[PDB]
Amino acid sequence: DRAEVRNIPFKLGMYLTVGGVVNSNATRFSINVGESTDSIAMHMDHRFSYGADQNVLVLNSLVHNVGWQQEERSKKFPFTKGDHFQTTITFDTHTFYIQLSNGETVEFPNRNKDAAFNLIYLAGDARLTFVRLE
Amino acid sequence: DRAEVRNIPFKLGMYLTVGGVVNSNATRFSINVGESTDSIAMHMDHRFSYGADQNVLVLNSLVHNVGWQQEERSKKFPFTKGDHFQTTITFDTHTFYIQLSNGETVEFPNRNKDAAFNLIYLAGDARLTFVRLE
Ligand SMILES: OC[C@H]1O[C@@H](O[C@H]2[C@H](O)[C@@H](O)[C@H](O)O[C@@H]2CO)[C@H](O)[C@@H](O)[C@H]1O
């Protein structure tokens, strides 16, 4: 089903590194950090072709029983279908710090000021091959 | 609920390191590698007090809709309630190689000759604090 790391707290000051492979013919895949599939503090969607979006990163938060908040977009897109990627995430109470495979970074606000997350998962057209959370 | 890493394949030649903390007043906790909570290729139970078992490791496999197979027991028990532990596991098609916090090792047969596992989880009276699967 989806690839997930559950109930191993991702706390302030820890680093999460995930590696994986994008499917050949991928439309989009996302990495999600939050509490559940309906409560996501940092959604990072990688869009190869989705609606009018082609080769863009879209970041947002999802509030339980409320929905998606304000999207932030980045044009940094070092991803190729069929190829590996590696992403590292850390955060403090104000900011998620994301580092992409090529060393470029994206920052996204920690909107709820959360200090720990109990669910990390990947969804969509990719698979994970390794994880370090420490 | 339980701490789990799901659908990030633990394959032949990868290493899994988990760290955690044993509950004060723990009865037992286990680390489990398999396919589901009813299909476990390597169950490693840490028994502080369970029936007549006190400070013993018990290893076994669980077959779906069939049950527990032949138990193997070890007397190596460098664990203290309320304290941290660290365990590393690797395997080939014949053997699971487990290394405990103090450097001692335990080996347990890979009874189904499996080459990849899609579920790693901890159950019982402990919690996980970090994981590396690579
Ligand atoms: O914001 C993340 C969220 O986006 C949804 O798609 C949006 C799309 O980004 C936007 O440009 C359009 O106007 O509305 C769509 C629907 O809200 C995705 O459907 C969702 O999965 C998230 O990725």
Ligand SMILES: OC[C@H]1O[C@@H](O[C@H]2[C@H](O)[C@@H](O)[C@H](O)O[C@@H]2CO)[C@H](O)[C@@H](O)[C@H]1O
């Ligand atoms: O073998 C692992 C399995 O053990 C069960 O407990 C056993 C116990 O080890 C044995 O000495 C006794 O005779 O029978 C019990 C029931 O089969 C646990 O209940 C189970 O959770 C596993 O840990």
